Design a protein around this ligand. Structure first.
Ligand SMILES: *[C@@H]1O[C@H](CO)[C@@H](O)[C@H](O)[C@H]1NC(C)=O
Ligand SMILES: [Ca+2]
Lengths: 247, 321
């Protein structure tokens, strides 16, 4: 159910300060659970995901389990969707489908013509060349192609068949993006500061915007949208925090 | 100021993914970072004029036709990515063209034991990172720079290790040796002993049949030994490793532990011991007492009885006799 068009993004919660500056975190928005999955960023060394049972046990640093991934991960673009994790295998444009329950990779898919490995990462870098996003429409891949001149390119990706189901060329440069996320098939480009660009895929149309985005700390590592409780899960310079959204 | 084929933007030259067998000659002198991966570039496609780009600091050349180590590179390159290439010979000449190199990745190449000209690294004195993941190394090179701080030799065929290979690498901090064919006789006497600043030791997925002794405890925080076939643990294996706060030994053939080996693991935090065939005899009673005396801070996993059958699956700290 579309929450609406985004009017504003504001900080809500501050969970703790982690010991890693970059990383990412989110929930499975398609599971009715308080499970939190946690992946800190170390370049060339990232191949694990730690699962937490609740929000309070997360802050206490009380993990449920740890998942050893079949491949390394490039950047903080990972995503969890319906009991299955999706991430970018190091030095490749390949997204890995990873079933959490049976603990096996169940598949893989190539994201056509994507620049990768700090060829078109985000502003802060860290192999952010590929960022995954979840919204009301399904599973997406945000990247930059050398044909589209390093500017953000989005594709809709089938989470079960791993087929690319459509593509849109935008006008915002991915090296400029501090991060990004999807809502109702609407792209939200962060600069850090501001959301200063959006792309509405339904119309295959974009528009320049000007919605505030908290500069609480400088190093915005990751920004992932959540359609369940309609929140942002953000990692900004060692800090694990939540942002509330205004519709 | 850029070639027609590639696209340049504020120091960043994008020549990647263009079926390049050869590097363009018309290049911006104010160049900073280069993208040449995913081309067909071999060693002859390197111009001599390329050397004069004194401001280039990072070069990505993975997945090309470099069939050996490249020359005529920007004198002041700090990052080099040569993975997914067909590299074989490595001369002193080749490395000396970039002594101001700091970070080197050679994953997915065809480099072997002797394939490196002896004393090649005697010139690259800025070299701090080294990646030999997935090569064809049968042993470890002797003439490695002291400035080396990390060393990845995962997924090679390493079976034997001489002492003066690793001695002299006091700047070494992390030592990764996954997927190699290492046995206890293949180990040097005090080959790890001199790595004073060593922090991580990862020896996952080898053929070790015992815990290694003579480990440096000066800075060792994390010690990895999973997926091995270890039977014994020598009483002095974990001696003086007092800064060790992590140690993993999952998937081994360990039944029993000798008395009082963890007395020296003062700063331990995490001890994972999964998938081991623990027998609970009078030899195992010392563990139970030690577990109860332990501060609540330290977490331990996989420590449950498989033998005898009567108490199989049962937590060791809970048993009477
Ligand atoms: C370890 O690292 C420190 C960094 O301060 C350096 O000064 C020292 O030379 C290195 N080696 C030893 C043995 O301390
Ligand atoms: Ca994102």
């Amino acid at each position: 159910l579309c929450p609406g068009l985004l009017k504003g993004v504001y900080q809500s919660e501050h969970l703790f300060e982690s010991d890693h500056q970059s990383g990412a975190w989110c929930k499975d928005p398609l599971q009715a659970s308080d499970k939190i999955y946690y992946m800190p960023w170390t370049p060339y060394r990232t191949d694990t995901l730690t699962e937490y049972s609740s929000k309070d046990d997360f802050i206490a640093g009380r993990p449920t389990t740890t998942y050893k991934l079949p491949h390394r991960v490039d950047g903080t673009g990972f995503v969890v969707y319906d009991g299955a994790l999706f991430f970018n295998k190091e030095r490749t444009r390949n997204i890995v489908k990873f079933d959490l329950r049976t603990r096996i990779k169940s598949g893989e898919a190539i994201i056509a013509n994507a620049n990768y490995h700090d060829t078109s990462p985000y502003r802060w870098g860290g192999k952010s060349d590929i960022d995954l996003a979840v919204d009301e429409n399904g599973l997406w891949v945000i990247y930059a192609t050398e044909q589209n001149n390093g500017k953000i390119v989005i594709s809709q990706l089938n989470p079960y068949t791993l087929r690319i189901e459509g593509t849109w060329d935008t006008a915002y440069d991915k090296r400029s993006a501090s991060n990004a996320f999807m809502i109702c098939g609407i792209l939200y480009v962060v600069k850090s500061n501001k959301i200063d660009y959006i792309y509405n895929t339904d119309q295959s149309k974009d528009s320049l915007v000007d919605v505030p985005f908290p500069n609480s700390y400088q190093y915005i590592a990751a920004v992932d949208y959540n359609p369940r409780d309609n929140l942002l899960y953000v990692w900004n310079n060692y800090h694990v925090v939540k942002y509330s959204l205004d519709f | 100021s850029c070639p027609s084929v590639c696209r340049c933007d504020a120091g960043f030259i994008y020549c990647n993914d263009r079926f390049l067998t050869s590097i363009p000659t018309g290049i911006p002198e104010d160049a900073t970072t280069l993208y040449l991966q995913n081309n067909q570039i071999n060693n002859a496609g390197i111009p001599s004029d390329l050397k004069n780009l004194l401001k280039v600091e990072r070069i990505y050349l993975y997945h090309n036709s470099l069939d050996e180590f490249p020359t005529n590179l920007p004198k002041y390159v700090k990052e080099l990515h040569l993975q997914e290439n067909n590299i074989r010979t490595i001369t002193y000449d080749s490395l000396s063209k970039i002594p101001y190199l700091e970070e080197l990745h050679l994953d997915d190449n065809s480099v072997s034991a002797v394939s490196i000209e002896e004393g090649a690294f005697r010139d690259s004195n800025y070299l701090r990172l080294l990646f030999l993941s997935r090569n064809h190394l049968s042993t470890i090179p002797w003439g490695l720079p002291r400035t080396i701080e990390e060393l990845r030799l995962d997924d090679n065929r390493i079976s034997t290790i001489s002492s003066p290979s690793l001695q002299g690498l006091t700047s070494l901090k992390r030592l990764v040796l996954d997927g190699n064919l290492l046995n206890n006789h293949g180990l040097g006497d005090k080959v790890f002993f001199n790595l004073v600043n060593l922090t991580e030791l990862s020896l996952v997925r080898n053929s070790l049949t015992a815990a290694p002794v003579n480990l440096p405890g000066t800075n060792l925080r994390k010690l990895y030994l999973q997926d091995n076939h270890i039977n014994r643990v020598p009483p002095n294996a974990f001696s003086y490793l007092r800064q060790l706060y992590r140690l993993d030994m999952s998937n081994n053939n360990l039944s029993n532990l000798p008395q009082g080996i963890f007395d020296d693991l003062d700063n331990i935090t995490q001890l994972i011991l999964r998938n081991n065939p623990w027998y609970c005899g009078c030899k195992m009673k010392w563990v139970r007492d030690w577990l109860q005396s332990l501060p609540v801070k330290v977490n331990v996993r996989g420590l449950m009885c498989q033998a005898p059958e009567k108490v199989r699956g049962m937590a060791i700290k809970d048993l009477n006799a």
